[PDB]
Amino acid sequence: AKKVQAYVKLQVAAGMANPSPPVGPALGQQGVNIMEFCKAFNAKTDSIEKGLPIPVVITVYADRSFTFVTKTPPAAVLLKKAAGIKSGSGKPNKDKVGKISRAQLQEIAQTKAADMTGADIEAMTRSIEGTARSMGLVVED
Amino acid sequence: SRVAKAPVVVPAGVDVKINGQVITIKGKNGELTRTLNDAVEVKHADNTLTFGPRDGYADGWAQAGTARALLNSMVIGVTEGFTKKLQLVGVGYRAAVKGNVINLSLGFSHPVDHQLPAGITAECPTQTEIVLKGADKQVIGQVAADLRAYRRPEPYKGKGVRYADEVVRTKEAKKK
Amino acid sequence: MALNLQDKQAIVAEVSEVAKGALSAVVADSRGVTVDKMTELRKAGREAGVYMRVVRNTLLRRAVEGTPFECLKDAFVGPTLIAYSMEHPGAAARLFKEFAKANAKFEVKAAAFEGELIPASQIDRLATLPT
Amino acid sequence: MKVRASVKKLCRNCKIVKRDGVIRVICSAEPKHKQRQG
RNA sequence: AGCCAGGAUGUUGGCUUAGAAGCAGCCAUCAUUUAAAGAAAGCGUAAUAGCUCACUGGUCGAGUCGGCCUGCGCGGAAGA
């Protein structure tokens, strides 16, 4: 790819078709037609699952064409649906929101192993635990 | 001190002569003369120029470092020459060169004609830009300041005479 | 980096890699970013993981102070940023020609991959390695 | 500029200089930190 | 101290979902990729973006940095 020209990382949940109210002007910073985006993104949405918090980088090129490479959903929200605690952090030091098994979080990170920039998966999975400490959890096994 | 002990590499063919307290050098560009402070004992005596804090005077080391940078920049002038790129930001601001006088229409009710001191050949490659060359770092810096003294860059749209690499911190209108 | 042993903790890590060393090369990092950081460190992760030496402390009185141990042919490596690469498993492994593939892959200024030892000469890219 | 009798570095880019006897705190970023005296 | 480099991965984190993405503020104040980079010091953004510093490569080349106790001084310091 190229250097910083006109792209940033945004776009929340993929289930939200045409997120003009939330994102808004960020799409308008460039000449990005949102329906042109929905034409391509929703063409990629119907591949695995619908209604998941997804992150994508809207990389715009000079010839008016734009490409996008998606990524795995946030470990923070993966922490909310896998365990069933939809609140999030809230109060990490006052109320421990939830807890999950090591075996579970390891294989969840193993799939993300091909999506992460790490070398040791054991070290990579405890990084998710570091996020779990940020969300207010207890690593139980 | 750290700059006072640094020898100055004077280029080949460049004439330098130390007449006691006064110094006169000359390269391809021009003749720059300067009188040093008595607290510094300077000696050519070589292929380079060494500086020494003469005895008696207490602040000798401070004065020595000063004198070094002067002659260092003096040999850069007589051999290369200095350039000051000025940019005139703003609609209606045109520059002109007439012999040795710069004509500037800086939005006033009258054109301002600045007189160039000596050896300063100003040139405007563009009507909104002035590439000004010279032979001495001191006076080239001063005349660049004077043209900027006619119109300092206002912090709202950056209108006015500025430098090439000058960054202007623009303020914003209160509400709208 | 606090005291003398702080320098020595790096040198013991240094000589440990030299005590079982093999083919090696060098690439500078004055034009590289964090993007190419994970291109050769993942290459290290392609071998096994982290222990692939890429420690950058090659001062003429630091890493050269650690060269008299072994690999004496590395005396005048001195300046021009040096980043090493070890091959503990696999005598004459792929790590040498990895920079040939890398120089054409987002690395532009790579100090001309001058290399260090084993051809018992100066830099020359060997492609006829025992696979 | 603030003609405060007591001056000190308000930020990171502030720096004390002693021009012509009086102590001045010039600032490289914001003009509001520029002060003179003390 | 300067001159050239990097200054990163999850990470749009959660809370009033109108937004607080190191940068209003509330919690943890992580672990990794590792020569190294605080989930953060300042500037700046509706929010991002963008620019620096922390730390770390090389170059360079000598001592130097932050405070304490004291002598003598400067500012603070304008009236008929």
Side-chain angles (χ1 to χ4, degrees):
Chain A
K2 285 189 271 287
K3 211 235 182 183
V4 182
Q5 58 188 320
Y7 63 100
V8 198
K9 183 241 183 181
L10 288 79
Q11 280 295 117
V12 200
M16 179 61 238
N18 188 25
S20 293
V23 188
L27 303 160
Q29 290 183 307
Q30 304 93 46
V32 181
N33 297 311
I34 198 60
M35 275 305 165
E36 176 60 40
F37 176 68
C38 288
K39 181 256 292 183
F41 186 54
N42 284 306
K44 263 73 175 182
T45 307
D46 58 348
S47 179
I48 298 86
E49 202 271 327
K50 294 285 186 60
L52 80 169
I54 201 72
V56 297
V57 55
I58 44 179
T59 70
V60 192
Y61 282 130
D63 50 7
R64 195 53 270 166
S65 67
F66 71 110
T67 57
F68 63 100
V69 180
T70 184
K71 207 183 192 77
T72 175
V77 294
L78 278 175
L79 183 153
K80 298 207 303 178
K81 268 70 75 175
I85 43 181
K86 308 301 184 301
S87 179
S89 300
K91 298 270 81 176
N93 281 43
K94 273 63 65 179
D95 298 313
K96 305 305 293 181
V97 196
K99 60 178 64 64
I100 203 169
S101 180
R102 274 187 45 180
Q104 302 187 62
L105 56 84
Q106 192 182 310
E107 271 48 57
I108 287 179
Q110 179 50 46
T111 53
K112 298 200 301 295
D115 305 354
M116 199 69 191
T117 60
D120 295 8
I121 181 62
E122 43 274 358
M124 283 188 264
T125 191
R126 57 163 174 267
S127 176
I128 307 301
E129 307 184 319
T131 309
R133 194 178 300 109
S134 174
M135 300 308 121
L137 305 189
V138 172
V139 182
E140 64 86 44
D141 187 60
Chain B
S1 61
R2 287 186 182 287
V3 297
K5 301 189 301 299
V8 187
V9 181
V10 49
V14 186
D15 169 67
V16 298
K17 62 109 172 181
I18 317 302
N19 189 224
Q21 189 63 55
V22 300
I23 291 179
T24 302
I25 71 173
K26 177 168 61 64
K28 66 83 177 184
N29 212 358
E31 177 184 58
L32 301 175
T33 311
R34 208 185 199 75
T35 61
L36 310 170
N37 187 45
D38 61 330
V40 186
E41 202 289 306
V42 183
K43 297 175 301 302
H44 177 199
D46 295 300
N47 182 72
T48 63
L49 301 176
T50 182
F51 293 90
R54 201 175 307 182
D55 57 352
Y57 316 107
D59 53 19
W61 271 107
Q63 302 285 305
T66 294
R68 194 271 180 173
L70 301 177
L71 280 70
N72 177 64
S73 298
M74 278 171 77
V75 301
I76 296 178
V78 299
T79 62
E80 298 193 312
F82 302 102
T83 66
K84 287 294 297 183
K85 191 184 301 297
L86 269 53
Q87 184 182 66
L88 279 69
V89 181
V91 59
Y93 301 141
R94 266 71 190 187
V97 177
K98 296 192 300 299
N100 60 306
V101 173
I102 309 175
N103 183 288
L104 299 173
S105 59
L106 301 170
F108 291 140
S109 59
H110 55 290
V112 54
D113 301 295
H114 189 62
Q115 177 80 280
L116 292 168
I120 306 301
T121 50
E123 197 279 331
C124 54
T126 313
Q127 301 186 305
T128 67
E129 186 172 39
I130 304 176
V131 176
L132 188 145
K133 297 189 182 64
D136 192 66
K137 196 175 182 182
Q138 164 61 218
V139 300
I140 191 171
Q142 189 53 61
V143 300
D146 289 326
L147 298 180
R148 183 177 174 292
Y150 289 127
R151 186 80 103 184
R152 297 176 171 68
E154 57 86 45
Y156 290 114
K157 290 177 60 59
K159 313 183 68 61
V161 174
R162 68 174 70 172
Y163 290 119
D165 295 312
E166 203 189 318
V167 51
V168 291
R169 180 60 267 179
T170 70
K171 297 183 61 59
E172 307 308 303
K174 189 181 63 177
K175 301 189 302 296
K176 302 173 184 178
Chain C
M1 212 287 270
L3 217 120
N4 175 53
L5 195 148
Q6 272 55 51
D7 275 316
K8 300 301 97 175
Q9 58 83 44
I11 202 164
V12 291
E14 183 195 329
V15 300
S16 63
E17 295 298 271
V18 190
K20 196 183 300 179
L23 276 294
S24 68
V26 54
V27 168
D29 189 29
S30 183
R31 286 292 98 77
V33 296
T34 49
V35 180
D36 48 69
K37 163 190 61 181
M38 270 303 288
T39 58
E40 305 201 316
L41 286 180
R42 176 63 180 72
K43 179 183 63 178
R46 180 270 298 175
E47 196 68 47
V50 194
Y51 216 20
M52 190 282 271
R53 201 85 292 171
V54 72
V55 179
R56 210 176 307 162
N57 285 293
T58 63
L59 267 101
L60 289 74
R61 298 287 270 176
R62 190 182 301 190
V64 182
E65 190 268 308
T67 191
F69 166 62
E70 209 274 305
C71 291
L72 277 293
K73 307 278 180 52
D74 305 58
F76 282 148
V77 282
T80 64
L81 294 76
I82 298 83
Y84 294 114
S85 295
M86 293 295 104
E87 288 175 32
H88 285 290
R94 310 271 73 72
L95 285 303
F96 184 61
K97 57 170 58 179
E98 279 298 314
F99 299 116
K101 305 180 248 187
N103 197 2
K105 183 197 63 183
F106 189 56
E107 194 185 56
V108 189
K109 187 188 71 62
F113 47 83
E114 60 191 53
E116 282 88 19
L117 190 56
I118 301 307
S121 178
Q122 55 91 48
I123 184 59
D124 64 304
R125 187 63 77 196
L126 277 297
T128 173
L129 310 174
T131 53
Chain D
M1 67 204 295
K2 293 298 189 303
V3 190
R4 199 163 285 129
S6 169
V7 297
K8 55 180 65 66
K9 284 187 288 293
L10 312 181
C11 71
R12 186 185 65 218
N13 289 115
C14 290
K15 47 191 61 180
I16 300 81
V17 70
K18 196 178 189 175
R19 296 172 182 170
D20 291 301
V22 300
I23 294 181
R24 305 166 182 282
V25 176
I26 65 173
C27 192
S28 305
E30 61 291 323
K32 291 191 290 186
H33 287 195
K34 185 169 59 177
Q35 29 184 38
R36 187 280 298 278
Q37 279 310 93

